[PDB]
Design an enzyme around this catalytic site. Structure first.
Site, PDB file in Angstrom:
ATOM      1  CG  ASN A  23      -1.950  -1.147   1.150  1.00 33.64           C
ATOM      2  OD1 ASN A  23      -3.047  -1.006   0.606  1.00 33.64           O
ATOM      3  ND2 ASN A  23      -1.573  -2.292   1.715  1.00 33.64           N
ATOM      4  N   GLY A  25      -0.640   5.535  -3.382  1.00 40.63           N
ATOM      5  CA  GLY A  25      -1.723   4.608  -3.656  1.00 40.63           C
ATOM      6  C   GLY A  25      -1.326   3.157  -3.450  1.00 40.63           C
ATOM      7  CB  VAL A  27       1.945  -1.577  -5.327  1.00 43.53           C
ATOM      8  CG1 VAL A  27       2.646  -2.651  -6.151  1.00 43.53           C
ATOM      9  CG2 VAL A  27       2.593  -0.212  -5.543  1.00 43.53           C
ATOM     10  CG  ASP A 141      10.633   6.151   0.010  1.00 38.11           C
ATOM     11  OD1 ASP A 141      11.045   6.299   1.184  1.00 38.11           O
ATOM     12  OD2 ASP A 141       9.561   5.568  -0.264  1.00 38.11           O
TER      13      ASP A 141
END
Length: 284
Positions: A23, A25, A27, A141
């Site tokens: 999660n 949005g 995946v 990230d």
């Protein structure tokens, strides 16, 4: 760039969803309906506002996912919904069967990885980051969950380039964490290199530094504290040096991506295919 959002077909017949993987949005494990081929599909809800950003994420994946260490882009689709309702954007990429490095950790007993495994992965992560940075793109990230693996032990990076909310601070670099000393905190290319260092510690010990600590305290400590070392002196001194190199508080003193790729922990890798096999054997 000059990308037309209205030209994006409804994914109907073209791609379908099979199941949920993670999660954010969301995946999904998806599938090309005709060929049957699997595909990683990221689904986002979309306003007329975010039209600007969507246009640029699509454009980003289109340009810089053509690399061996970055998950390849297939296409983008919009499921249009009635007026007033938000539409759904689909980003379809290469599907990585063995999932993430994080998954890889929970599946190995001890939740720790062989150093040669860590060496391989980091070399591959660096190569993708190197590609990114050369094209003026920050990943932003880097963590085990954004480092995916195929079934042939190919390391692939995902979710790069993308309010008044904060998030998980554990992989953040001291220059990202805004405080009194550092008011206008901005991401740098070298920030990804700090995240990588934390990601390497995540593989070695199972969790990032300050893991069993509240996210608000971890956000607090990362600037003020020294750079995290490995808690064990049983590691090779190359690996330790590599953690020391990645994890430099002052980023102006932090080596660039090109510098780190030359590091002995990365550059000297015999048993490379030995690692790639033991990885394949683990993917079961």
């Amino acid at each position: 760039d000059e990308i037309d959002l209205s030209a994006l077909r409804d994914p109907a017949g073209i791609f379908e969803l099979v199941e949920l993987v993670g999660n954010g949005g969301q995946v999904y494990k998806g599938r090309h309906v005709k060929t049957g081929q699997l595909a990683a599909i990221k689904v986002m809800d979309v306003t007329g506002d975010e039209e600007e950003e969507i246009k640029q994420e699509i454009n980003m994946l289109k340009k810089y996912s053509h690399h061996r260490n970055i998950a390849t882009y297939y296409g983008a689709f919009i499921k249009k919904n009635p007026p007033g309702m938000d539409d759904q954007l689909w980003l379809v990429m290469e599907f990585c069967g063995a999932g993430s490095v994080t998954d890889l950790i929970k599946n190995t007993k001890g939740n720790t990885l062989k150093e040669e495994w860590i060496a391989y992965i980091c070399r591959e992560i660096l190569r993708g980051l190197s590609h990114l940075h050369q094209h003026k793109v920050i990943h932003r990230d880097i963590k085990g969950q954004n480092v995916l693996l195929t079934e042939n032990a190919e390391v692939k990076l995902v979710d790069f380039g993308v309010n008044t909310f904060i998030g998980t601070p554990y992989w953040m670099a001291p220059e990202v964490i805004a405080c009194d000393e550092n008011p206008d905190a901005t991401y740098d290319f070298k920030s990804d290199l700090w995240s990588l260092g934390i990601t390497a510690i995540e593989m070695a010990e199972g969790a990032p530094p300050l893991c069993d600590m509240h996210p608000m305290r971890a956000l607090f400590l990362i600037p003020r504290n020294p750079a995290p070392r490995l808690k064990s002196k049983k590691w090779s001194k190359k690996f330790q040096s590599f953690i020391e190199s990645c994890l430099v508080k002052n980023h102006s003193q932090r080596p660039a991506t090109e510098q780190l790729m030359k590091h002995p922990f990365i550059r000297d890798q015999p048993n490379e295919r030995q690692v790639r096999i033991q990885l394949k054997d683990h993917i079961d």
